[PDB]
Copies of this chain bind each other. A is one copy, B any other.
Amino acid sequence: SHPDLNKLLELWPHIQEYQDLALKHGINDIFQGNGGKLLQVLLITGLTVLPGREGNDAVDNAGQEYELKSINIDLTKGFSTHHHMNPVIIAKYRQVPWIFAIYRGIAIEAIYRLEPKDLEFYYDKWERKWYSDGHKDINNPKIPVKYVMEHGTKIY
Protein backbone atom coordinates (compact mmCIF):
# COMPACT_ATOMS: atom_id res chain seq x y z
CA SER A 1 0.00 0.00 0.00
CA HIS A 2 1.05 3.63 -0.62
CA PRO A 3 1.88 5.92 2.40
CA ASP A 4 -0.90 8.44 1.57
CA LEU A 5 -3.57 5.80 2.43
CA ASN A 6 -3.15 7.23 5.94
CA LYS A 7 -4.51 10.70 4.87
CA LEU A 8 -7.44 9.06 3.08
CA LEU A 9 -8.46 7.54 6.42
CA GLU A 10 -8.60 10.82 8.38
CA LEU A 11 -10.66 12.47 5.61
CA TRP A 12 -13.26 9.70 5.12
CA PRO A 13 -15.80 10.56 7.88
CA HIS A 14 -16.19 14.04 6.33
CA ILE A 15 -16.63 12.51 2.84
CA GLN A 16 -19.38 10.21 4.29
CA GLU A 17 -21.24 13.24 5.71
CA TYR A 18 -21.21 14.80 2.22
CA GLN A 19 -22.55 11.60 0.61
CA ASP A 20 -25.32 11.57 3.31
CA LEU A 21 -26.32 15.10 2.30
CA ALA A 22 -26.37 14.05 -1.38
CA LEU A 23 -28.65 11.06 -0.59
CA LYS A 24 -31.05 13.41 1.27
CA HIS A 25 -31.36 15.29 -2.03
CA GLY A 26 -31.64 12.28 -4.38
CA ILE A 27 -28.05 11.68 -5.55
CA ASN A 28 -26.88 8.06 -4.92
CA ASP A 29 -23.18 8.33 -5.87
CA ILE A 30 -21.20 11.58 -5.60
CA PHE A 31 -18.34 9.91 -7.53
CA GLN A 32 -20.11 9.40 -10.91
CA GLY A 33 -21.59 11.77 -13.51
CA ASN A 34 -20.40 14.93 -11.70
CA GLY A 35 -22.58 13.87 -8.72
CA GLY A 36 -20.84 15.90 -6.02
CA LYS A 37 -20.93 18.96 -8.33
CA LEU A 38 -24.60 18.49 -9.23
CA LEU A 39 -25.54 18.85 -5.50
CA GLN A 40 -23.98 22.36 -5.36
CA VAL A 41 -25.95 23.55 -8.38
CA LEU A 42 -29.21 22.11 -6.97
CA LEU A 43 -28.84 23.73 -3.52
CA ILE A 44 -27.85 27.14 -5.05
CA THR A 45 -30.74 27.24 -7.59
CA GLY A 46 -33.44 25.41 -5.61
CA LEU A 47 -33.93 22.84 -8.43
CA THR A 48 -34.62 19.10 -7.74
CA VAL A 49 -33.55 15.75 -9.31
CA LEU A 50 -36.52 13.30 -9.28
CA PRO A 51 -36.33 9.52 -8.65
CA GLY A 52 -36.49 7.59 -11.91
CA ARG A 53 -35.02 10.46 -13.97
CA GLU A 54 -33.04 9.44 -17.08
CA GLY A 55 -29.89 11.54 -16.60
CA ASN A 56 -28.86 14.76 -14.85
CA ASP A 57 -32.21 16.44 -15.65
CA ALA A 58 -34.00 18.48 -12.92
CA VAL A 59 -37.26 20.39 -12.27
CA ASP A 60 -38.35 23.61 -10.51
CA ASN A 61 -41.26 24.36 -8.10
CA ALA A 62 -43.73 24.40 -10.99
CA GLY A 63 -42.60 21.13 -12.53
CA GLN A 64 -40.69 22.55 -15.54
CA GLU A 65 -37.76 20.28 -16.67
CA TYR A 66 -34.17 21.41 -17.36
CA GLU A 67 -31.04 19.70 -18.81
CA LEU A 68 -27.95 20.25 -16.57
CA LYS A 69 -24.39 20.27 -17.98
CA SER A 70 -21.04 20.88 -16.25
CA ILE A 71 -17.48 21.74 -17.34
CA ASN A 72 -13.96 21.88 -15.87
CA ILE A 73 -12.34 24.91 -17.56
CA ASP A 74 -8.87 24.09 -16.22
CA LEU A 75 -9.00 21.29 -18.83
CA THR A 76 -11.41 22.19 -21.65
CA LYS A 77 -13.38 25.04 -23.29
CA GLY A 78 -16.32 23.11 -24.79
CA PHE A 79 -19.31 21.37 -23.07
CA SER A 80 -19.92 17.66 -23.96
CA THR A 81 -23.30 16.57 -25.36
CA HIS A 82 -23.85 12.96 -26.61
CA HIS A 83 -21.38 10.24 -27.89
CA HIS A 84 -23.95 9.22 -30.59
CA MET A 85 -25.85 12.42 -31.62
CA ASN A 86 -28.79 12.14 -34.07
CA PRO A 87 -32.34 13.62 -34.54
CA VAL A 88 -33.94 11.41 -31.86
CA ILE A 89 -31.43 12.70 -29.24
CA ILE A 90 -31.95 16.33 -30.37
CA ALA A 91 -35.78 15.93 -29.94
CA LYS A 92 -35.21 15.15 -26.25
CA TYR A 93 -33.33 18.49 -26.03
CA ARG A 94 -35.56 20.89 -28.02
CA GLN A 95 -38.26 21.94 -25.57
CA VAL A 96 -36.37 22.42 -22.32
CA PRO A 97 -34.11 25.25 -21.17
CA TRP A 98 -30.50 24.30 -20.19
CA ILE A 99 -28.49 25.14 -17.00
CA PHE A 100 -24.68 25.33 -17.59
CA ALA A 101 -22.30 25.29 -14.59
CA ILE A 102 -18.65 26.41 -14.89
CA TYR A 103 -15.88 25.00 -12.64
CA ARG A 104 -12.17 25.43 -12.01
CA GLY A 105 -11.47 21.82 -11.13
CA ILE A 106 -13.75 21.63 -8.11
CA ALA A 107 -14.50 25.27 -7.23
CA ILE A 108 -17.72 26.55 -8.87
CA GLU A 109 -17.35 29.93 -10.61
CA ALA A 110 -20.66 30.66 -12.38
CA ILE A 111 -24.04 29.34 -13.60
CA TYR A 112 -25.93 30.37 -16.78
CA ARG A 113 -29.45 29.64 -18.09
CA LEU A 114 -30.16 29.22 -21.85
CA GLU A 115 -33.65 29.03 -23.42
CA PRO A 116 -34.65 26.87 -26.46
CA LYS A 117 -34.44 29.92 -28.80
CA ASP A 118 -30.78 30.40 -27.90
CA LEU A 119 -29.82 26.78 -28.65
CA GLU A 120 -31.49 26.44 -32.12
CA PHE A 121 -28.22 27.44 -33.84
CA TYR A 122 -26.65 24.19 -32.60
CA TYR A 123 -29.69 21.93 -33.15
CA ASP A 124 -29.76 23.08 -36.81
CA LYS A 125 -25.97 22.65 -37.29
CA TRP A 126 -26.08 19.07 -35.96
CA GLU A 127 -29.06 17.98 -38.06
CA ARG A 128 -27.41 19.43 -41.18
CA LYS A 129 -24.21 17.43 -40.63
CA TRP A 130 -26.07 14.20 -39.84
CA TYR A 131 -27.77 14.32 -43.25
CA SER A 132 -24.58 15.29 -45.13
CA ASP A 133 -22.62 12.34 -43.76
CA GLY A 134 -25.17 9.70 -44.80
CA HIS A 135 -27.00 9.38 -41.47
CA LYS A 136 -23.84 8.80 -39.45
CA ASP A 137 -24.16 9.60 -35.70
CA ILE A 138 -21.99 12.58 -34.60
CA ASN A 139 -19.35 11.76 -31.94
CA ASN A 140 -19.76 14.27 -29.07
CA PRO A 141 -19.90 17.70 -30.79
CA LYS A 142 -19.22 20.59 -28.31
CA ILE A 143 -20.98 23.83 -27.19
CA PRO A 144 -18.28 26.56 -26.61
CA VAL A 145 -18.09 28.19 -23.16
CA LYS A 146 -17.90 31.64 -24.81
CA TYR A 147 -21.20 31.05 -26.66
CA VAL A 148 -22.83 30.10 -23.31
CA MET A 149 -21.49 33.19 -21.50
CA GLU A 150 -22.54 35.59 -24.28
CA HIS A 151 -26.02 34.23 -25.11
CA GLY A 152 -27.20 33.07 -21.67
CA THR A 153 -28.51 34.87 -18.54
CA LYS A 154 -26.11 34.62 -15.55
CA ILE A 155 -27.93 33.38 -12.39
CA TYR A 156 -24.90 32.90 -10.11
> Judging by beta carbons under 8 Å apart, are A31 and B37 in contact?
yes
A44 interface hit (Cβ, 8 Å) = yes
Determine how many copies of this chain the complex contains: 2
A residues apposed to B, CB below 8 Å: 1-2, 4-5, 7-8, 11, 14-19, 21, 23-25, 28-37, 39-40, 42-46, 72, 75, 83, 105-107
Are A2 and B46 in contact, CB atoms less than 8 angstroms apart?
A: yes
Contact of A1 with B46 at beta-carbon distance under 8 Å, contacts A28-B75, A34-B32 already known: yes
- Residue of A14, A37, A46 most packed against chain B (CB within 10 A): A14
Q: How far is the CA of A42 from the CA of B19 in the complex (A)?
A: 21
Establish whether residues B36 and A33, one from each chain, have CB atoms under 8 Å apart when the complex forms: no
B4 & A21 in contact (Cβ 8 Å cutoff): yes
B31 touches A31 (CB 8 A): yes
Contact A2 B43 (CB under 8 A): yes
Is B21 a contact partner of A106 (Cβ separation < 8 A)? no
Asked whether, in the complex, the Cβ of A105 is within 8 Å of the Cβ of B28, the reply is yes
Q: A30-B36, A46-B2, A83-B83 are in contact. Are A15 and B14 (CB under 8 A)?
A: yes
